[PDB]
Amino acid sequence: GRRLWAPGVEAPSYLNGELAGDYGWDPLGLGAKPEALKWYRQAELVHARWAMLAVAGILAQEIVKPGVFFYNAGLPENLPGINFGGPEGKVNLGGLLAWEFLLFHWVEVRRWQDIKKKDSVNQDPIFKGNKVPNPELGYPGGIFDPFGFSKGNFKEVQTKEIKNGRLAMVAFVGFIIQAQATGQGPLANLGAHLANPFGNNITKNIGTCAIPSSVDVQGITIPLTCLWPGH
Template identity: 40%
Template sequence: MALVVGRGFLVQPCSSSFICKNVYKPLSGVTNTFWPTRPGTTRCLTQTVARAQLRPTWLPGLDPPPYLDGSLPGDFGFDPLGLGEDPESLKWYVQAELVHARFAMLGVAGILLTDLLRVTGISNIPVWYEAGAVKFKFANTETLFIVQLILMGFVETKRYMDFVSPGSQAEGPFFGIEAAFEGLEPGYPGGPLLNPLGLAKDITKSRDWKLKEIKNGRLAMVAMLGIFVQASVTHVGPIDNLVEHLSNPWHKTIVQTLANSGS
């Protein structure tokens, strides 16, 4: 009979007629411990088995849900709402996270670069949250909106069709560039247009690249959330906030800024 203690330990009791080490072979990660007993009783060997965590999780010691088995890049068992219990929903959420991560990385890079150009005076451009209200001379707002709607709609439609039927977007003529839309697998397009450096020609052996991308993408999504909050509170760009903080690091902090915003 075995007694389970908590979630991580297994204690195997011994019979008084023999020593446990004759029955239970020592395993990796198993500690054999002799506990002294009262005189006249048989000394019993107990084995405490610390269940080793096979992979890192977002909260150390927490068992990941069974449907997150570590096969997905960046899978650390994080799904507190159980959104991925359905296999089909999980596939869609994986693609949704990947797209949001890529947009976030582009957004953070674009905001920081343009804000740096604005603060240094290299270019006379508006702060990022006012860029959408700028009137351009080469086209009016309505035209730009329609063009963006068509282009983004085309790209997103192709992405969705590739998700539904992987590899289908490389079939049929398309201005002679159909090979550029040949996906390596859903969410990872290939070809000379979308993978010019050929970093992941064999997508089945590119787990490290996938892991790096999703990690940086998640960091970028958190960064975008921070940029949104700081713009709402301080009404300036991130570079302005950084310059102000560096001018007085001990008194110009996020805590004091948030505290002063509520007063």
């Protein structure tokens, strides 16, 4: 790109502005080969959008249910009270995993076949009239862009997407490390910092791993660890 990640540095010869959010940042040179660069661009796009949805979900769940730790949201009793069927309607998490596994296997194999060969799985397999335009890799469109917001400046809104996604990824890492260090949600952490800035910051919580070593979820024991050896 033109504006680079640091003053005085030079961009690599393979990074000069095809992609959005190009700051010429590849210190390890992982995108030196174009096939690897395409694969890592797909990975960055899906990581950015998943972190985007995750930050939105973590922030919204603390508004609606502030009393539920998002780190403990996988616990069966932290689930919303809904009927899953059977004698009692309780969750089982096996069928819950099975639903997501089947649906995501289908959709991610579709995306993978798109990544391997461009414009190879654009057509709907059942109703062959339906079609996806797919102007660029990672940007399918069609029913994925119903409001047609990409008809204008595609590069500008792509830059907005990738920059917000990078911010969301950094924010999700912050969410996880803060939840592991404090045992509280992100907005609770923000309120604690706003209450006592010099008495409650990273220097008072980084040595502690507030997450328990293991948890028991309906008959099985999932081992747990922090991202650093806290106690």
